[PDB]
Amino acid sequence: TVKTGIAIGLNKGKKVTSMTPAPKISYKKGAASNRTKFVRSLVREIAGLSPYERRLIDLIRNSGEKRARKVAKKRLGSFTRAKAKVEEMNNIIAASRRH
Amino acid sequence: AISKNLPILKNHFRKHWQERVKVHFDQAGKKVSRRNARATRAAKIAPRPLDLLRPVVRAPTVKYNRKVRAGRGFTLAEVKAAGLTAAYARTIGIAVDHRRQNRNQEIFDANVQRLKEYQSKIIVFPRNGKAPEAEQVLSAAATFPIAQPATDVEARAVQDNGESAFRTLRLARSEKKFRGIREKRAREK
RNA sequence: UUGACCUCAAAUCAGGUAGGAGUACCCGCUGAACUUAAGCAUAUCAAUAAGCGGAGGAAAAGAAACCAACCGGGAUUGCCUUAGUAACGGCGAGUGAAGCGGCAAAAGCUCAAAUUUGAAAUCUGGUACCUUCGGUGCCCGAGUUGUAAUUUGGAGAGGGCAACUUUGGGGCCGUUCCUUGUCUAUGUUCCUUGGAACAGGACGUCAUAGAGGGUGAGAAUCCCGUGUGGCGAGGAGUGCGGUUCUUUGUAAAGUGCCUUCGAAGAGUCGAGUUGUUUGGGAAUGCAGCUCUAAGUGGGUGGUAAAUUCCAUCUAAAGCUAA
RNA sequence: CACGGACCAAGGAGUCUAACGUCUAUGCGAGUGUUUGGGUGUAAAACCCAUACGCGUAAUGAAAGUGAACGUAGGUUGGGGCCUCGCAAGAGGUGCACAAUCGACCGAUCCUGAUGUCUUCGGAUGGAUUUGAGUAAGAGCAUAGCUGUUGGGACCCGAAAG
RNA sequence: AAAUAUGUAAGAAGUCCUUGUUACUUAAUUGAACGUGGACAUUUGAAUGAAGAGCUUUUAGUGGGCCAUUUUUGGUAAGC
Ligand SMILES: [Cl-]
Ligand SMILES: [Cl-]
Ligand SMILES: [Mg+2]
Ligand SMILES: [Mg+2]
Ligand SMILES: [Mg+2]
Ligand SMILES: [Mg+2]
Ligand SMILES: [Mg+2]
Ligand SMILES: [Mg+2]
Ligand SMILES: [Mg+2]
Ligand SMILES: [Mg+2]
Ligand SMILES: [Mg+2]
Ligand SMILES: [Mg+2]
Ligand SMILES: [Mg+2]
Ligand SMILES: [Mg+2]
Ligand SMILES: [Mg+2]
Ligand SMILES: [Mg+2]
Ligand SMILES: [Mg+2]
Ligand SMILES: [Mg+2]
Ligand SMILES: [Mg+2]
Ligand SMILES: [Mg+2]
Ligand SMILES: [Mg+2]
Ligand SMILES: [Mg+2]
Ligand SMILES: [Mg+2]
Ligand SMILES: [Mg+2]
Ligand SMILES: [Mg+2]
Ligand SMILES: [Mg+2]
C-alpha cells in the first residue's frame, strides 16, 4: 500500500511515513454479541415463521433454491437481501426435519 | 429583441427580485460592532487569549494538498502524546477534535511539538484564587504561527540516470489502463 | 359477606394550565392566475401572492448513517468565491446548485438498550416550623408494566495489580453594566442705524466650551446648553477584585497495566408503484398504497444490472450560546 | 367639411439597477484588482495590511488526451523614419507598425508503422485539394464617462379579460 | 440587323538578353511555375478632371411612398 511518488498510475501520490490509527469502536456497530444471539434464537422458537417464509421453504424443497431467490427478491427489496434470506431458510430446513 | 453583434447575456431578473435586494449600508457599522464585541469579550475572560490553540493539517484535494493550514482541533492521540487528558486540555485553551485521525508521522510530530511549546509558554493560575495579575495577550495564533514545512535545499548536484520523465508518465498511464484486460487474459489461459 | 386489583366515570372537589392580540423578521401547510415563450397546452411567472396553523428576541440549524478519492478534511450559521458554472429545459423561451479555498463567529453534549437486589437508594402533594424563587420533620400518594446512582461509541463496563494529583456550599465590602440627579468658563463696555442690536464700527475676555436652540433682525462671551471633570441616589447580574463564616468526607473525580466482555433505536431501513417537487439526469427530496429486512450488519460513494474488492461514516431517539 | 385645443396658474413623461459591445481619459503593466475581512481613526470619512480569489499570461479535442523556434523566430512584394553619398534631383543601405502571399510550429481528423515487447502493448519516422475562436521577443487588469444591448413598472397615460 | 446601354485593355506588379530550383511535365534540360544577374525612367506609353488617397470600428432613423417626360402590361376608360 505504498505510493509510487508520481502523479499518475495505480498507486499514485506522495510517499509519507505511515501511521496506524487506533481502531474506532463505532466500526463494530453491527457486530453480534452473546446476549443478542441468545435473544434472537429464543424469539425464533417462540414466534415461529412468517407466511412468506413458509412458502419459500416449500419452493426450496419442490423447485430448488434458484427459484426461491427469485421469489425472495420480489417479497424483499434488493437481490442481495434475497441471498441471505434463502441461506437462513436452508439452515432452518437442515435443523427442522433433516436432523 | 435580438440585434447587432453582441454577446448572449443571461441576466436572471424575471422574478420579484426587487423585494429581495440587500444593500450593506451597515458595513462600517458592523465593523465597529465587531470591534466593540471583541473588546468587551477580552475584558470578560480575564487574561485569557480570546482564541484556542489550533493544530496544523494538510488541506485535502490534489489542488490544495501542497499547503498546510489550521485544523479544528488536536486528535486524541496527539493530546495523549503531549502528556495530558482531553478533558483537561479543553479547559486549558486547546481545541480537541475526536473525529480527526493520525496517519502521517510528519503531521503527528509537528502537532505534538506545538502542544509542548504551548504548555511551556503559558502560566496556569491555581484554583485557590490568589490570581497574580499578568498581561493579557489577545492572540494565540500570532504567538504560535503556522509555517509551511521545508521541501528541498537551495542547490544540489544533477543526477540523471538516463531515463525519460515523459516516458515514465506515458508507461504509468498505459499500465493502469490495461491492467484489467491483462489480468483477464492471464486468468483465462 | 368483607377486602383488594384493573378499567371507566362524577364533583362550584385541592392546585394549575390553554384560547385572544400583534405578526417586520422566523418554523410549516395549502396554493393561483395576469405575465414570458412575439400564437399555445409542457415550461415560465413560482415551489411566489392570497388562504390556514405555530414561536422568539431572534427563530431555525447543529456536534456527521458528512465531504471526499487528497500527503485527506472534520458540528451548525453567515460573508467573499466557486458560478451564470456541472446540470435541467417543446435542449425553445428560460432555469441552475454543491465539494474545495479566504474570512466572521466558535462549544460542547445525553437518553434507550446492564440485577441497587446485602435492602426504590427516586419523586408530586398535605401538614407543622424555619434563614421562604427554597429548607427540615412527619403522614398519605406515585412507582417494580421500573423511579435514582452508574455507561452513550470519542467509547465504556465487571474482576485483579501498583501509584500519586485535585475541591464544596454561603455572607459582606468593592469592581463591571444599566436606569437617574447635581456641580463645574468668558462683555451685555462705548459710537452710528433702528420700534427692537442679536447689525456696522472701536476696544476686551474665555476656549479640551466658535455643536445646537432661545431671547423684539446674522449672539462663543445675555439665558439654556456645549467641552472637561468632581460629587451622589436606586436596582439587576455572581462575570470577578478583596475579606469573612461553614469541612464538606472512611465523599467525589482523573491517570498505568493484565484478563473477560463490550447490550447501540422495525411497518423502520430498503423495494415496487402513483403524485408532487429538485440543477439531480434508468428517477433529488417529500407523501399515499403494496411488499417488508439484516447484525463481520446497515447507509453513502451523482448511469440501470450481475460478480469481486476498496473507501467512508453509524440512520430509523434527544438538548445546546455566538 | 380629419383628430386634440374656451381661458389661466401650479404639477406633468428615456430614469435607476445587474451583466455586457465599441470608443475615450487615468493608474500600473506580464501583470493587475487596498475597502469579504483585519489594523487604525479627529469615527459611516481619511490612512494602513496578510492570505486567497477573479481576469490575463496556451491552445485544441465529444472525450481519454496531447501541447507551440530547421532558420539573426523564415522567405518574397510594398512600407514611415533613420544612415551613407550628393548643391539639389536622386542612388544605395537598414527597414518598426500595417497589408498581401508562400512556408515552419501546436491540437483535431485521415494515413505510414522504426528500435523494443506482460504478444499486444509501445508510436519513433515520414506524409495528406482536411480542420481550430492557435504559436511565431507577450497586453492586459482596474476605475470613470458619452453612446448602444438585455432583464426589470423600464419614456408617460390606456384595454376587452384572468 | 441598328440606335441607346454593356465586358476588357492602353506598362515598372512592364518589356527584353543570359541562366538557377523541383518529388510536376517531356522521347529528351522539353515545358510549366517561381527566382539570381544585366539593359530600358517619368511625351513612362491616349483625352479631361481629381476641397487628397486608402482603410477600420461603431451606431441613429427608415423598410406605407407619390408625381413628371420617355419605354411599357391589364382594362372601354379612370385623378385606375
Ligand atoms: Cl425519469
Ligand atoms: Cl483530443
Ligand atoms: Mg465513526
Ligand atoms: Mg375547584
Ligand atoms: Mg419557513
Ligand atoms: Mg404568449
Ligand atoms: Mg405579445
Ligand atoms: Mg393569448
Ligand atoms: Mg402569504
Ligand atoms: Mg414576546
Ligand atoms: Mg443574535
Ligand atoms: Mg432554538
Ligand atoms: Mg456522534
Ligand atoms: Mg463543516
Ligand atoms: Mg424554479
Ligand atoms: Mg404542492
Ligand atoms: Mg436529462
Ligand atoms: Mg440515471
Ligand atoms: Mg433542536
Ligand atoms: Mg384618431
Ligand atoms: Mg374639441
Ligand atoms: Mg411648470
Ligand atoms: Mg415637468
Ligand atoms: Mg440611464
Ligand atoms: Mg385565459
Ligand atoms: Mg410602418
- Give me the DSSP letters along B129-167: S-----PPPS-STTTS---PPP---S-------S--HHH
Closest CA to A19 of B107, B102, B59, B100: B102
What's the sign of the alpha-carbon dihedral A85, A89, A90, A94? positive
Evaluate if the CB of B105 falls below 7 Å from strand D.
Answer: no
* Cα distances (Å, whole numbers) of residue B90 to B54, B111, B175: 12, 16, 50
State how far the Cα of B109 lies from the Cα of B97, in Å rounded to an integer.
17
Residue B54 contacts residue B95 (beta carbons within 8 Å): yes
Distance from CA of A71 to the nearest CA of B (A): 34
Task: Write B177-184 long-range contacts (CB < 8 A, 24+).
Answer: B179/A10
Closest CA to A51 of A77, A73, A75: A75
B65 grid coordinates = 494538498
Closest CA to B108 of B56, B60, B54, B53: B56
Give bridge partners of residue B58 from the DSSP assignment: B68
Give bridge partners of residue B56 from the DSSP assignment: B70
Closest CA to B71 of B104, B34, B44, B46: B104
A64 grid coordinates = 430448488
Residue A22: its chain B contacts at CB < 8 A? 77
Q: CA angle, corner B166, sides to B165 and B171, nearest 5?
A: 100
State how far the Cα of B146 lies from the Cα of B10, in Å rounded to an integer.
43
| N-to-C CA span, chain A | 48
Residue A16: closest C-alpha in chain B: B104
Evaluate if the CB of B5 falls below 7 Å from strand E.
Answer: yes
Assign domain A16-99 to its CATH superfamily. Ribosomal protein L36 (1.10.10.1760)
A99 grid coordinates = 436432523
Place of cell 427478491: A73
Amino acid at B5: N
Resolution in angstroms for this experimental structure? 2.2
A36 grid coordinates = 443478542
Residue B80 contacts residue B70 (beta carbons within 8 Å): no
Question: CA A75 – C1' C29 distance (Å)?
Answer: 35
Residue B124 DSSP label: P
Contact A21 B172 (CB under 8 A): no
What's the sign of the alpha-carbon dihedral B49, B52, B55, B57? negative
| Most A-contacting residue of B104, B166, B182, B183 (CB-CB within 10 A), to test interface | B104
Residue B64 contacts residue B72 (beta carbons within 8 Å): no
Alpha helices per DSSP H over chain B: 27-44, 61-64, 76-82, 86-92, 105-120, 165-177, 179-188
Question: What domain range is B95 assigned to?
Answer: 21-126
B116 contact partners, CB below 8 Å, separation of at least 6: B82
